[PDB]
Amino acid sequence: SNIIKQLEQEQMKQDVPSFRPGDTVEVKVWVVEGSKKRLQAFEGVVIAIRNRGLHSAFTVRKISNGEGVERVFQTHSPVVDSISVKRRGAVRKAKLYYLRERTGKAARIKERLN
Amino acid sequence: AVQQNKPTRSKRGMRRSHDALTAVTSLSVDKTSGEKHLRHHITADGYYRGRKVIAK
Amino acid sequence: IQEQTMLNVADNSGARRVMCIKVLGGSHRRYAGVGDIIKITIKEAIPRGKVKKGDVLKAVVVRTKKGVRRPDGSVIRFDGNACVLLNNNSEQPIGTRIFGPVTRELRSEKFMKIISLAPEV
Amino acid sequence: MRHRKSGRQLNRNSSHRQAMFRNMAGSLVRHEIIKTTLPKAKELRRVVEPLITLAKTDSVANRRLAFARTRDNEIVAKLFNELGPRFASRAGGYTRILKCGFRAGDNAPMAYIELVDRSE
Amino acid sequence: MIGLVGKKVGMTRIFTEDGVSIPVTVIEVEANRVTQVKDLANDGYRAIQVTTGAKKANRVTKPEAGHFAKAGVEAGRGLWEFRLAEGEEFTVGQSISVELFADVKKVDVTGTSKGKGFAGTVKRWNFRTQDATHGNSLSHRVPGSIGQNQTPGKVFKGKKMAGQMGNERVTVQSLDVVRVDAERNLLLVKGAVPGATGSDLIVKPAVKA
RNA sequence: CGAUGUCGGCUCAUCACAUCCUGGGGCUGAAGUAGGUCCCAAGGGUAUGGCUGUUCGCCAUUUAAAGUGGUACGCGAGCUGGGUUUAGAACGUCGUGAGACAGUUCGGUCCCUAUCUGCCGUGGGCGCUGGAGAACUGAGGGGGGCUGCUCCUAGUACGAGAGGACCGGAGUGGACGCAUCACUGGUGUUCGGGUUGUCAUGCCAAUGGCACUGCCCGGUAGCUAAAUGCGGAAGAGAUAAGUGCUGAAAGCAUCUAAGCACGAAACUUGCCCCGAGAUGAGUUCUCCCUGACCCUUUAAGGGUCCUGAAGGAACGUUGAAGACGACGACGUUGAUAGGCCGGGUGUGUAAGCGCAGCGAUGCGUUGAGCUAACCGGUACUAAUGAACCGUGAGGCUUAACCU
RNA sequence: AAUUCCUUGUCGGGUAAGUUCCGACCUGCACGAAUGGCGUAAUGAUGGCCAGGCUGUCUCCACCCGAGACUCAGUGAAAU
RNA sequence: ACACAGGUGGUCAGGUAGAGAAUACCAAGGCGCUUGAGAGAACUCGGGUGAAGGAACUAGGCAAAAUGGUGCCGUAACUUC
RNA sequence: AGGACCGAACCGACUAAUGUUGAAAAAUUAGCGGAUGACUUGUGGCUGGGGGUGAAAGGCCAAUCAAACCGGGAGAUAGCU
């Protein structure tokens, strides 16, 4: 509809960088332990969506302490304050699930258009 | 799955009370030709309401 | 997560693999996500620890393959279910170190004691 | 049930539906007016009109696409040479569907589907 | 305390500053026009007749046109009623109708339900399907026993069987309003509301709250 | 006995109260926490596994609780076929033997297309007293009724200590139900890509057919739960057991005989839904039709000409509506569907050309090409003008306001 | 024990929990030596038990592809 | 019984992949199985795919799912070797 | 070499589902066993009813077998319906 996304346009944020699947981005999220608010870093390889509006969610993957952790994040949430691309990647898929379950296998890096 | 008593002609008639055909009760007459046809249908002379749309 | 679910063990003293035999709380409870306490049997035991094979006790699920849901709409998904073995009567953790991540909804009293030894939260 | 769903199953499997739509589109492009059943014609609009819209733009890629559909180079030549140059100004609505009577063996509501600018 | 008639637009999310991500649905509530006011003398009760939207004046018949033209002419999509005990309303329309919901906190939304159609027992009720492998000749999703042998001799009058599921007026209670937009003509309540998009909704303040 | 299918399990229930939990009280050898026993109460709830064919039982682990029964020891024209209970075979035992056993052991065909009652839904006809379009009141009828833990009251009252409340607030759960697809996901054989074997399009290139959609990798809309919102209460009226005030019969005593006040999840409400065929057929608002005659037993009508109104129906394009009817949107005064245009999405850098390399292949053009069911527009195609039904002021008696 | 009524005998193993199973004891109701006793490699669409993998068997179902069911036209039964 | 998914001896044996007379697509050749048309309910039949769990189902892993080929390494108790 | 191994033709019939007025008076689909031998199969012949034949089940002897079919004794008899 047209009444829908008139609210969502005001609820977007314009500071989202451009990501591709295969990029190992660093997501800084907000965490509240007590009365204080703190930034937590979560770096990992992205298995993304394309921008569905306000309902856009990207899935990143980190092998933390020997256990692989997959965390989605809404790309318009106030919890995520900044995302940084870090090292880029050259893969041929929009979804990298078969390349996320395996371990010890890495994605190569493209210089341009990735 | 079988009956225990025979249904009668009265019960047969009340069952067939809804098995009755309904006629068209309305036939449109075309403008270019005066021959009648079913509504929203070709006249079988090849004519729809504006022109002879079908040669056959 | 469910009955007959084999979970790995996070702490050092609680050993190897454990089968969940009951989810506690509630009359006909089907599932156990993270912050709740299940009953276990010990199917594999490392030879050293105070844990022995075939011992019934309690455990709190520190990792789940389905994961938890943050209120902002996001989920944290792991590969593999894990638990920390607790005492049966006092419900305190048995081991001295917790291996692997432990999610923030273990934020209450004994689970705060689990955060005090967990590496990444 | 089926909510917000399109297409007709037409009492056939998918490969048969694709093949019969291919042959029906080829027959319509060749003869410019064919008589079929009503739902077959109603799906024939949805398969034929993208082919004419693709025939509007002349390129080797569009000819290979409209050979991947309809699989007939005579249909491809007639389409990209005479159907779309003819409908070049017209934006939509290349097929007109006129209802006819019923078949004799079974009462199937028939319909004539025909190109709107017929050469004959 | 009366309510008003809206239309279901869809479902979105409202990101709060804390990060709560409240699931909302949007009800497009235009200017409701009071058409007829009922009183205790002419009728046996006390309520008002409202209308919303507009019609094309070719689908408006002569009785509908006469009823609308009586005391303030504007054709609407339909007519509804709202009971009242201590409120008094005029017979002209409401200018900004949604602003009577800016003070309420919990509303109670009513709309039609989506039609599932002729549905089985497993879809309609939460009936248990029987076994899929161990024998089970032609009896996977069938109803099981429907009665109690000869001593009743009959199936009881409330028996759960297969039938039409959907197209029922479903009233969902105690929903939190998060935003009332006067100039946008919108009312944002939290969570799930009956109907597809484009269905006619009835919002009222909550009887429970 | 010209046939009423047997135990147990699956699915589905419904009733009784001789109450397992929750609710309300009397007594206690009832300090508190906990109990024991008895009275009232059926509104809701009342496990998962190991063994056994098992009901049962023992056991493990929960729960507030894991009730006792009736219904052909409920339910085989609903399911199973482990048990029992045909024909094969064996062991122990009996018999000379054929054979036999409430013994044991391995294997052993479970049919029916629903006429009637009965329920689950959905229509057609007529009635409702002129004909229609709607909005309703509510006599009835159903649905729902469960409950744990933590904190404050408060380590307070009580108790030597140990321990530890009633009463009253608040948060968060388990089971269940209703709705929904915004999130997380599933499917998505109508979207895109990779790849194998073969055949064809004259051949390279590029495509298509078949091999479960050939095999996969993702995926839009819809549908969905594992996902997300919400909900069973608060509050009245009358009460059961119980507790009383006043008060005689019976100078006292007594909840009772007169009078009066409390008292439960049970009853009637309150919350949600169906509901005027509620023949007792209801109420309100609006719209529409106010012409000539002829024949005639005249508790009354019949026929002709002119007129067909409001509205409905038929037909067509159709829908988050639907088995068919029904319901809803629209019918050129139009966005009802298809097409087209723009986006979104989803695959993931199309074809052709050029460069590098011996070649597979890599790179530029290029986030390119294609894209459904989605969103916003656009009369290009189909929704033709008619035609059909429905009439012409709507009975009698009695009474009020007029006249 | 294809044999044992009491019997789910008693003890041990396996399981969180084992009337079945495996190993023992002998109290053989009512084993036993060509009506063959005991053992055994290989074999078995043979009977019982456990483990790995695997999964809609199941927790608990959800969607989809086709053939019927449903509507229309032609023909047109049956038990009772 | 039937223009009946059953039964019926021998002979020939093309291409590609393949050990093959298996199997997939095809040659020569023969067919589209003698009721159709719509719609896309429950329910039944035959299949496809499933979050998390993995036999908790059940008389019983019934049924489905799983592994599957060639070359090489390597292989236990027992044994009539 | 082998009543040897894997596996099509061929022969068989262990499990499940479907069908049960069936497509069929025992089949189909998906798996299953043997597949150089006590194999399998074509043509003709022989064994006859208290009889034949049987790697034995009261199995088979023309959809029929603890005594086939056909005709006769025969309108057996029936204290039963």
Swiss-Prot record, chain E:
Any one Pfam family match given in the protein's UniProt record, by short name: Ribosomal_L3
Biological role stated in the UniProt entry: One of two assembly initiator proteins, it binds directly near the 3'-end of the 23S rRNA, where it nucleates assembly of the 50S subunit.
PANTHER family xrefs: 50S RIBOSOMAL PROTEIN L3, LARGE RIBOSOMAL SUBUNIT PROTEIN UL3C
Keyword RNA-binding listed: yes
UniProtKB keywords: Methylation, Ribonucleoprotein, Ribosomal protein, RNA-binding, rRNA-binding
GN (gene name): rplC
This protein's name: Large ribosomal subunit protein uL3
Position of the signal peptide: none
PTM per Swiss-Prot/TrEMBL: Methylated by PrmB.
UniProt cross-references to NCBIfam families, sorted A to Z: L3_bact (TIGR03625)
Species, as recorded: Escherichia coli (strain K12)
GO biological process: cytoplasmic translation; ribosomal large subunit assembly
SUPFAM superfamilies associated with the record: Translation proteins
Entry GO CC: cytoplasm; cytosol; cytosolic large ribosomal subunit
